[PDB]
Amino acid sequence: VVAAFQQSGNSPMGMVLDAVPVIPPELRPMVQLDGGRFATSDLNDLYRRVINRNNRLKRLIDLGAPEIIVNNEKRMLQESVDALFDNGRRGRPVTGPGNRPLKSLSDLLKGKQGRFRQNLLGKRVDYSGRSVIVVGPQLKLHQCGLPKLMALELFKPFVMKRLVDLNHAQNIKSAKRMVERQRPQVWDVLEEVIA
């Protein structure tokens, strides 16, 4: 351990923090669900705890009080930061609802729901679909049969460009409306665009 620190060229002081960072709000959004029932991530609660502890500590220092209360406040602030960075890593985890632990800051990375394993589980992609498969013995080895509904909904941008190109629709908005309504003019272009 000591040699790892020595060869680094940095200093061990980085372990003792003097200013914690806060993630951008979009990573901890506060959205309104239908019915005016607000929804927010527990990161907001943890940050509120830390901010309140720090402000109270500043107020105590400014006012001046026996060292016992100041030490208790500092201990509370330390515990608040600890709970922010990880829940259950030390002591009793904090629980607001139904004795449910709050998802700590480091919890976005570790566990089945962590970012690393979630990335390892893959993403979700556009221009895709699924359906039941039925044997077709009339096809060549390099062919497959796509239902025309799925093909229309999946090839829509190419179809709409060709539709405007052929002058069936005046503009992209009209072509999109035509595809949505599935006018009879669309099938010829759809068969033409997936040659």
């Binding site: 940095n10 372990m15 923090l17 960072p21 951008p24 509120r48 901010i51 720090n54 330390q78």
Partner: protein, 98 residues
């Protein structure tokens, strides 16, 4: 562009946090109860993190689109897209080390 030879991880120091943060969070308020807007120096302040709506100002003095990178002197909020709100960071000033 996309020339990433290496990606290293180091132990951040107080000065790194100071210089990689665009503001300080000095109050716990998140959002106003009635007007539904971020509160000053709060966890969602536009002054710190960015405008809620693209090319829009907190006070509306520079609500026009043709104002890029101009910080409004009336409220100090930059005029850029809302996607910046997903990027910019802030830091809290611990009264005692932890």
């Amino acid at each position: 562009v996309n020339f990433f030879d290496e990606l290293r991880i180091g132990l951040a120091t107080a000065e790194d946090i100071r210089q990689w943060s665009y503001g300080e969070v000095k109050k716990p308020e998140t959002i106003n109860y009635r007007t539904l807007k971020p509160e000053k120096d709060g966890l969602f302040c536009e002054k710190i993190f960015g405008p809620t709506r693209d090319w829009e100002c907190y006070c509306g003095k520079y609500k026009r689109v043709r104002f890029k990178g101009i910080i409004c002197e009336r409220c100090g909020v930059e005029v850029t897209r809302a996607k910046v709100r997903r990027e910019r960071m802030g830091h809290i000033e611990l009264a005692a080390p932890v």
